[PDB]
Amino acid sequence: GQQANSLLDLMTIRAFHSKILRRFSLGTAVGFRIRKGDLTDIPAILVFVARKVHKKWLNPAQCLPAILEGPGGVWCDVDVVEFSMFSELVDKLCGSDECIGSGSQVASHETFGTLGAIVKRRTGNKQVGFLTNRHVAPNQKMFHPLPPNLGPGVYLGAVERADVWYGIYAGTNPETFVRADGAFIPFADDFDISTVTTVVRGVGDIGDVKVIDLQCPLNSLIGRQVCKVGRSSGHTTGTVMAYALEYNDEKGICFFTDILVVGENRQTFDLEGDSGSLIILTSQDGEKPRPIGIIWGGRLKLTSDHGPENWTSGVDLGRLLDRLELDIIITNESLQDAVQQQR
Amino acid sequence: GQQANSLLDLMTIRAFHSKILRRFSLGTAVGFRIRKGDLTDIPAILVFVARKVHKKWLNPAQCLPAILEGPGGVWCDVDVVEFSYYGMFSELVDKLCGSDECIGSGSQVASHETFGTLGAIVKRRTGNKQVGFLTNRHVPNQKMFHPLPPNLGPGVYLGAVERAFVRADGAFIPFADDFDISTVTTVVRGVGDIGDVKVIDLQCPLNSLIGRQVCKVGRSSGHTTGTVMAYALEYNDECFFTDILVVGENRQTFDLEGDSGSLIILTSQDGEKPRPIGIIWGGTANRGRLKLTSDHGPENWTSGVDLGRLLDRLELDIIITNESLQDAVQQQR
Amino acid sequence: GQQANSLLDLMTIRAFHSKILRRFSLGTAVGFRIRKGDLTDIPAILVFVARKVHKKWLNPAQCLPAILEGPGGVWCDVDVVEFSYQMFSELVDKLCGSDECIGSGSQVASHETFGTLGAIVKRRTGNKQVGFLTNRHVAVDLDYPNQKMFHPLPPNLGPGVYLGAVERATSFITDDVWYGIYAGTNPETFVRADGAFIPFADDFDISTVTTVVRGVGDIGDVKVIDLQCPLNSLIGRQVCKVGRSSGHTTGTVMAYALEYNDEKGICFFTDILVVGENRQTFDLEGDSGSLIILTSQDGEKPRPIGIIWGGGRLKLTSDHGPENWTSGVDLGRLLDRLELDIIITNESLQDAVQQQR
Ligand SMILES: Nc1ncnc2c1ncn2[C@@H]1O[C@H](COP(=O)(O)OP(=O)(O)OP(=O)(O)O)[C@@H](O)[C@H]1O
Numbered sequence A: 001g002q003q004a005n006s007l008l009d010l011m012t013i014r015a016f017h018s019k020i021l022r023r024f025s026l027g028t029a030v031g032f033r034i035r036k037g038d039l040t041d042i043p044a045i046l047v048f049v050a051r052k053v054h055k056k057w058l059n060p061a062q063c064l065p066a067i068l069e070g071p072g073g074v075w076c077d078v079d080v081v082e083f084s085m086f087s088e089l090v091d092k093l094c095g096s097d098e099c100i101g102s103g104s105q106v107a108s109h110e111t112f113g114t115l116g117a118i119v120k121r122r123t124g125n126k127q128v129g130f131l132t133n134r135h136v137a138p139n140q141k142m143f144h145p146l147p148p149n150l151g152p153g154v155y156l157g158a159v160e161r162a163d164v165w166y167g168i169y170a171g172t173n174p175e176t177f178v179r180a181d182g183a184f185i186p187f188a189d190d191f192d193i194s195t196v197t198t199v200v201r202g203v204g205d206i207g208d209v210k211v212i213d214l215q216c217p218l219n220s221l222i223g224r225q226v227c228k229v230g231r232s233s234g235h236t237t238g239t240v241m242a243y244a245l246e247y248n249d250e251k252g253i254c255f256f257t258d259i260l261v262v263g264e265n266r267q268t269f270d271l272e273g274d275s276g277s278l279i280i281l282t283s284q285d286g287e288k289p290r291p292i293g294i295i296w297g298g299r300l301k302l303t304s305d306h307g308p309e310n311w312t313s314g315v316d317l318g319r320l321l322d323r324l325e326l327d328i329i330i331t332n333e334s335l336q337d338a339v340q341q342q343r
Numbered sequence B: 001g002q003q004a005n006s007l008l009d010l011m012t013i014r015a016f017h018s019k020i021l022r023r024f025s026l027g028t029a030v031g032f033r034i035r036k037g038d039l040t041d042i043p044a045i046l047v048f049v050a051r052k053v054h055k056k057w058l059n060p061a062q063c064l065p066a067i068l069e070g071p072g073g074v075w076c077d078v079d080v081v082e083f084s085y086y087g088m089f090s091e092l093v094d095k096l097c098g099s100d101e102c103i104g105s106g107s108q109v110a111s112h113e114t115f116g117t118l119g120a121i122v123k124r125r126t127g128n129k130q131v132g133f134l135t136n137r138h139v140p141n142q143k144m145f146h147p148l149p150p151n152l153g154p155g156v157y158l159g160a161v162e163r164a165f166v167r168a169d170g171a172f173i174p175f176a177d178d179f180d181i182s183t184v185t186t187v188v189r190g191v192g193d194i195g196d197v198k199v200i201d202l203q204c205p206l207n208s209l210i211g212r213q214v215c216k217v218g219r220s221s222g223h224t225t226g227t228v229m230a231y232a233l234e235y236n237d238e239c240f241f242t243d244i245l246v247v248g249e250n251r252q253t254f255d256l257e258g259d260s261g262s263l264i265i266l267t268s269q270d271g272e273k274p275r276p277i278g279i280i281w282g283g284t285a286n287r288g289r290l291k292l293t294s295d296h297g298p299e300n301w302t303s304g305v306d307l308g309r310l311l312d313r314l315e316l317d318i319i320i321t322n323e324s325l326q327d328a329v330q331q332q333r
Numbered sequence C: 001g002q003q004a005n006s007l008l009d010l011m012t013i014r015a016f017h018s019k020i021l022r023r024f025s026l027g028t029a030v031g032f033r034i035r036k037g038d039l040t041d042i043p044a045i046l047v048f049v050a051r052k053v054h055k056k057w058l059n060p061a062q063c064l065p066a067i068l069e070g071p072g073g074v075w076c077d078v079d080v081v082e083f084s085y086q087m088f089s090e091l092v093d094k095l096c097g098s099d100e101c102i103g104s105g106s107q108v109a110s111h112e113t114f115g116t117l118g119a120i121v122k123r124r125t126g127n128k129q130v131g132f133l134t135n136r137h138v139a140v141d142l143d144y145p146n147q148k149m150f151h152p153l154p155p156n157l158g159p160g161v162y163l164g165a166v167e168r169a170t171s172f173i174t175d176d177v178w179y180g181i182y183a184g185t186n187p188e189t190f191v192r193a194d195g196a197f198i199p200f201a202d203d204f205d206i207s208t209v210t211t212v213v214r215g216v217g218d219i220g221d222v223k224v225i226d227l228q229c230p231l232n233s234l235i236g237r238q239v240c241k242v243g244r245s246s247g248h249t250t251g252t253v254m255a256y257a258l259e260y261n262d263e264k265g266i267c268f269f270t271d272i273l274v275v276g277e278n279r280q281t282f283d284l285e286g287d288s289g290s291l292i293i294l295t296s297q298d299g300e301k302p303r304p305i306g307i308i309w310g311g312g313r314l315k316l317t318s319d320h321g322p323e324n325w326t327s328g329v330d331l332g333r334l335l336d337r338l339e340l341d342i343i344i345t346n347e348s349l350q351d352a353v354q355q356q357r
């Protein structure tokens, strides 16, 4: 009966008790216990409650336990958490730059956001396009910086358009369930890809996607510093606080997202319009920063001294690329290789 | 014909001219004249008007006089004030709203219909001598929880509200039969130990109440300090009477919505314990402007229910030490 | 083929190229080129666009040229500007009803609207009535109990004295269809920013009126905006305004002769554009009608040049957000249009009052 040591361990304990944990919680996630506002190294399932109160005011047997035991004697802690812009860089991202890349504004007749990454299809026509958040509203036409009806811009491409077993074994509410996801926009045939850069302007050259391994120690992901560059807030930095967040409505889970990020220094990590931004691990030892997710477009009580903070939903990048069968392009050389290999 | 020297003097003068004063005012109160934004020592009837303008733009019949004489030649000043009915995050507020291990003055109390602040720990003077708490009376029992009622969130059941123009009033919630009173403290967190209620004497000099610094601890704004600006406020739109008027210090609001029921406490000027004089009244909590200086915009004002007169009418005694509280629990029948 | 050297030079160039300038812009004005957030001394036509973007995202049809040449070879620059279409003090308190006099900056209100008194004026001819000048409200219900001005409030809202009734606008050249077609106006929507004259009521006590501008002081005579003199007499000059909502503010004149577009043509014209100094707004709602006054950095008395017109992004630098802009009505031309003279001393007012017929 060993203590949990990985994201998978926490996720199976959380799943094993999910039906009961939804009875007294708004949702759950996995990470490290947060105690007196500070991150611990104690693996835990984070339980989100509408209002966190002292034990004395809870009904008998309404107090969440401190420990949970899953299959095989693997155990973990239980942690209760309450769930209640103008710069040179932003100016370049929104249309004043001579190149298009990560951070650039992308807009349709219906939505607007940030271009996350330049990617290519692994198979088939091997088209070169970009990756951004999947908006929750088929042939949606993407322009930078604005669609024709609102102002000038070039046509980038159309969003590529693409379950019962979720409601069966995950207990999702089929009427309301949404899993945070990304979308692939292949570049239109007549779009000039020589105007594309693989650099992230506010950070610099990035390395290849950092795959989130669910069996490695938790401090590989939880507590890591990240940054993002988006059209609305420019450059911001945050911390990865949790993984595999489940959110609950009255009849089951209604929201899942892979990554939870909180901005540093009680500052918001993202604003509306930053959805699609690349979530990047900042470099701690001199290596190139590596992306881990995409921002997907409530407040979180972390300190008792200050008010609740905004939180950010992220899509696991490595699993997104696998699901869409895409490769990230991180050099101009790789990009020119990808372009000439389009069929 | 001596000048007015007490609250009673001002009020008897005010009553004698009541109809005449209401004809061109939203309401009246008694206190000290406010001149060039500063409090004077000049006893005055405060006349509250929707919009204060220079006399040159007023018709003579609407211009208020500067002096009024009541029965027996007792006289006072008349002071015109622009007025209207219409118009956070800290360790302390967190404790008041549910994270503390005790319940007391400042603690959040809520029902399915209302929410506010617990003002004082009190007991019935006679009969069964039940121990309960005092808060504002909101304008079929309304049974109260800390911090939240079952339909909105977690909390312990405190008790049901006892039911006793709108006059500002407080209400007594006797603690439920199964409530653990050992979780109650008579300390006002953020202020300390308080002394006994300070009776508002209507015949002593005005400077005992008007102009005194006060503080309150409430679930919405934590600790704030202010000044008592007037007594015996009467309002008539076309309506409501409250005992105490407070304006927050440093052009900062004295209360926010949810602070109603908070204890209004005279700060200690010489080393004695601070003494309560009132309870914040709900309604007019967030609503209401008050022009005090022409340098700054209008300021918020707060309504207070006279505590000493509230306790008498409900026949309650305030409990101000945890020893007195332990005793009162043992004497309940 | 000389460079443009006056407002008239820039405006004739702008007219000669009206079709090209209007096809992809929200509007145009004339002034000095703005570069890297700063005013230059380069005469230019300002072209206002909803979003300013890099050349790489523009079709050659939509990319504006940097220079335009008109008839006779006279040329100028073209500058692209990103565009679009409550304060408490001792002064504001006096302006809103606590002062013992009425004058420029005082609050004036009707049953429907409120604003600022601009200037004390008199008719040149006829009965030579004394009154005041304020903005002409558009989209307002000007029917019998709505042209009645009071200070500070109308009888339904509070106390105040009756000042007079707004005189309907007698005109414009825009109303001539023949001229309108040549200028490209849309008749269905076009609005000319304008002022209005309120003659004082027969029983209004004019001895309660002052010609002083509180917060600035005594003013000189109206400064006529000359269209053939060098641009730096107006463009870039610092101005101030006293109004009921924001009290005293200072700004800079950024452009002249703004023409604003809609789907069919020109729908708004105003004479002056002002931007507040130090990234702070020049006006708030209710300051409309305030006198726009040239500040005197020399020792002469400040001179009025316009009136604030009432009821825009104008993003100038990349580090700061968009700034508000203010529409001003050319005072000298407004006075000519309404056949009015401004009264600038309290002795001169008494003369005009005794000279009323
Ligand atoms: N179902 C519930 N609803 C609301 N609050 C609860 C519930 N269950 C437990 N709590 C509160 O949460 C507390 C446990 O919080 P948590 O597990 O985060 O402690 P911690 O992390 O060690 O310390 P900190 O509170 O500083 O994080 C319990 O003592 C109880 O007061």
Ligand SMILES: Nc1ncnc2c1ncn2[C@@H]1O[C@H](COP(=O)(O)OP(=O)(O)OP(=O)(O)O)[C@@H](O)[C@H]1O
Binding pocket: B024, B025, B033, B034, B035, B036, B037, B049, B051, B052, B053, B054, B055, B056, B058, B062, B063, B064, B078, B079, B080, B081, C159
């Ligand atoms: N019915 C009324 N409605 C509105 N305003 C009035 C009315 N009657 C008097 N006033 C205004 O109130 C003024 C008197 O104000 P007040 O009594 O407050 O003077 P003060 O306190 O000595 O000086 P300050 O005005 O600085 O407080 C009068 O000069 C008049 O302008």
Ligand SMILES: Nc1ncnc2c1ncn2[C@@H]1O[C@H](COP(=O)(O)OP(=O)(O)OP(=O)(O)O)[C@@H](O)[C@H]1O
Binding pocket: A152, C024, C033, C034, C035, C036, C037, C049, C051, C052, C053, C054, C055, C058, C062, C063, C064, C078, C079, C080, C081
């Ligand atoms: N129709 C249009 N819509 C939006 N933007 C345009 C249009 N035509 C040109 N532009 C942009 O406007 C720019 C010209 O701007 P402008 O004339 O203000 O330059 P500048 O004043 O010398 O420098 P600054 O940009 O610092 O003012 C061109 O580089 C082009 O990117």
Ligand SMILES: [Mg+2]
Binding pocket: A033, A034, A035, A036, A079, A080
């Ligand atoms: Mg914790």
Ligand SMILES: [Mg+2]
Binding pocket: B033, B034, B035, B036, B079, B080, B081
């Ligand atoms: Mg006064």
Ligand SMILES: [Mg+2]
Binding pocket: C033, C034, C035, C036, C079, C080, C081
């Ligand atoms: Mg420019």
